Amino acid sequence: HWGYGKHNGPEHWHKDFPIAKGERQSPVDIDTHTAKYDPSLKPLSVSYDQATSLRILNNGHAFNVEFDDSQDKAVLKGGPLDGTYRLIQFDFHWGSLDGQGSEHTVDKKKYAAELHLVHWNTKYGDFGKAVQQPDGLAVLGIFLKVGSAKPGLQKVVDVLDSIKTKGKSADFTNFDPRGLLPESLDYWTYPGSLTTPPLLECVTWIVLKEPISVSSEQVLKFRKLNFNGEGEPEELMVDNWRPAQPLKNRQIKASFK
Numbered sequence: 001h002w003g004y005g006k007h008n009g010p011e012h013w014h015k016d017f018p019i020a021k022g023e024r025q026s027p028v029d030i031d032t033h034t035a036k037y038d039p040s041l042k043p044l045s046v047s048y049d050q051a052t053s054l055r056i057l058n059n060g061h062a063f064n065v066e067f068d069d070s071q072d073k074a075v076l077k078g079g080p081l082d083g084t085y086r087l088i089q090f091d092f093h094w095g096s097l098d099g100q101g102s103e104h105t106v107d108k109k110k111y112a113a114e115l116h117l118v119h120w121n122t123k124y125g126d127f128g129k130a131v132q133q134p135d136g137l138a139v140l141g142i143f144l145k146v147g148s149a150k151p152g153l154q155k156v157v158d159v160l161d162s163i164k165t166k167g168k169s170a171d172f173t174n175f176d177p178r179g180l181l182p183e184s185l186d187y188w189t190y191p192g193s194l195t196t197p198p199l200l201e202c203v204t205w206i207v208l209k210e211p212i213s214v215s216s217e218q219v220l221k222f223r224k225l226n227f228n229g230e231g232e233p234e235e236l237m238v239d240n241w242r243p244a245q246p247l248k249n250r251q252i253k254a255s256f257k
């Protein structure tokens with residue numbers, strides 16, 4: 001099955017998922033000089049006050065924090081979006097070394113990691129119907145750099161010891177994802193895909209310009225997770241990023257002058 005190694009990683013994925021070589025694949029390099037300010041962008045609204053997390057899972061690729069999305073709670077709207085999109089999960093991608101780890105890049109610069117807050121368009125009723133639609137998802141992407149600690153990340157870091165291997169999961173309630181957001185909501189936006197198989201082309205990407213800082217100790221704990229399941233040879237969970245894909249016929253729009 002797919003992964004991030006030599007024989008099953010991103011260069012192989014097109015075999016089982018031919019959309020890998022599609023017209024609106026993610027991530028991409030954000031050329032900041034080529035991105036155009038768009039004054040028609042409405043203000044971005046991130047309303048996470050009533051977010052309710054359910055659990056955290058190691059899926060053998062990364063860890064997912066999954067939210068109860070049964071009520072109208074944790075909504076992203078505005079900016080490039082029409083209508084309302086509801087938070088269902090967040091996930092990270094990171095490196096073996098601080099010099100790499102992010103999926104999107106900014107003028108070719110790789111950040112130490114990247115966080116994705118995944119939301120579905122409530123016009124489509126649930127996540128599974130939404131991913132069948134070209135406007136079904138909005139992913140808020142946030143870069144992480146190594147420096148000062150992020151206090152609001154520490155609850156995630158501490159729970160990782162309990163989900164070390166593939167297939168392990170834990171309850172994970174009352175996690176507030178507002179504690180993972182930088183000060184500025186300045187962003188770039190473009191139409192793209194999920195960055196893991198099945199690579200579906202359903203996503204409006206909204207990538208924040210301002211990174212959050214996390215400490216070296218916090219990201220070292222991410223690197224202690226395992227790809228393998230319990231009782232197979234230990235392969236550390238690192239470098240679970242897909243590299244930048246061709247931009248094709250797309251334009252990246254900036255929300256800021």
Ligand SMILES: [Zn+2]
Nearest residue numbers: 091092116195
């Ligand atoms: Zn992701």
